[PDB]
């Protein structure tokens, strides 16, 4: 029974809490206090292995403090989440990787790029563009919908496998 620490990061409104609550509680919260930053725990079987998931749903202001640095540093993998209909969030994905590589002191930190709200009728970020950025980073890319559960397990579980392969 292994303990895996996952940090879900992303810009304001992308669906971090929505995605996390779906994983933990199997329902869709279409409105959740955006200030609430919590840790959650879930036990799951991933490839026949009982896993202990410690998911940190980040929310707080993107402040750069020594506590926030080691608070993030405890994470083994990071879900980098943008919304497919929010270009500024996708442009943020670069800076997020930068902070991840800094506190972790590594160019090879387990990440998964998540395009959320892929249930939407339209979008302003095309899949090909994100896959390019994912390749240019050497990380997976998953489209998810916290509204319908599409790819939610796929996204989180894939971060776990990326953590496995790191040791």
């Amino acid at each position: 029974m292994t303990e895996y620490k996952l940090v879900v990061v992303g810009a304001c409104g992308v669906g971090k809490s929505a995605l996390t609550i779906q994983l933990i509680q199997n329902h869709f919260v279409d409105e959740y206090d955006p200030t609430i930053e919590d840790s959650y725990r879930k036990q799951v079987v991933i490839d026949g292995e009982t896993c202990l998931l410690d998911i940190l749903d980040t929310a707080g202001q993107e402040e750069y403090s020594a506590m926030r640095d080691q608070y993030m540093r405890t994470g083994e993998g990071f879900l980098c989440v943008f919304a497919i209909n929010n270009t500024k969030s996708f442009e943020d994905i670069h800076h997020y990787r930068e902070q991840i590589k800094r506190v972790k002191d590594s160019e090879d930190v387990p990440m998964v790029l998540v395009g959320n709200k892929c249930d939407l009728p339209s979008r302003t970020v095309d899949t090909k563009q994100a896959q390019d950025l994912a390749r240019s980073y050497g990380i997976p890319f998953i489209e998810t919908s916290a509204k319908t559960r599409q790819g939610v397990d796929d996204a989180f579980y894939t971060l776990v496998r990326e953590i496995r392969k790191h040791k």
Partner: antibody
Amino acid sequence: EVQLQESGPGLVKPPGTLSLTCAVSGGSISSSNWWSWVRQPPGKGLEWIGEIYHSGSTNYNPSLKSRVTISVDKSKNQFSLKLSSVTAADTAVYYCARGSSSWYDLGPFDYWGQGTLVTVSS
Amino acid sequence: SVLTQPPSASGTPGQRVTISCSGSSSNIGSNYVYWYQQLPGTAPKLLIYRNNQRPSGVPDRFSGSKSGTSASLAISGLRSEDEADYYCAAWDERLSGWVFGGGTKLTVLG
């Protein structure tokens, strides 16, 4: 950041049962932390009462075990304390607290309510 | 209280003051110690966690250590704003509960 607030009868008559409720906002009760009750007789030191996890598991101060019940009401995002057979020894300020983070341990009392004075008296 | 602290401590400003905390093999000897500072009429605030780590907002003149079944809080460069009550806490394996010291009231002299 999470915030806790105690509320309960200021006065409890002996034989009676002290009943308190901790309203929690800015954080889900289903988070991976432990929710504690701590008390402090006026002018004296802190005494841990007990703690509960959101699944329902509890650990009580063994010295209070036969009189303490702690509950969680996820639907109201509250946990609660019931302490039976009160005596004057239970007169104290009662605090609720969250701590014992699964993510990064800072100890058992990361966040405190303001505390409510309960007087036990005839 | 299960842990033992001196009820009071003194110091003139600028000095270094230490506050001791003694337990047994089943609490301090086995587990981490945590320190809390309580000001008049307010809830306690975490001061030191895991024997010697400082949370956000605790200056480096506060420091803690732990040896065997004893733990120690050190305050160097004592200031007037340090007048408070200081409490140690640890998990006790035999009681299966959190135990405290009785608390130390720190007075800044002069």
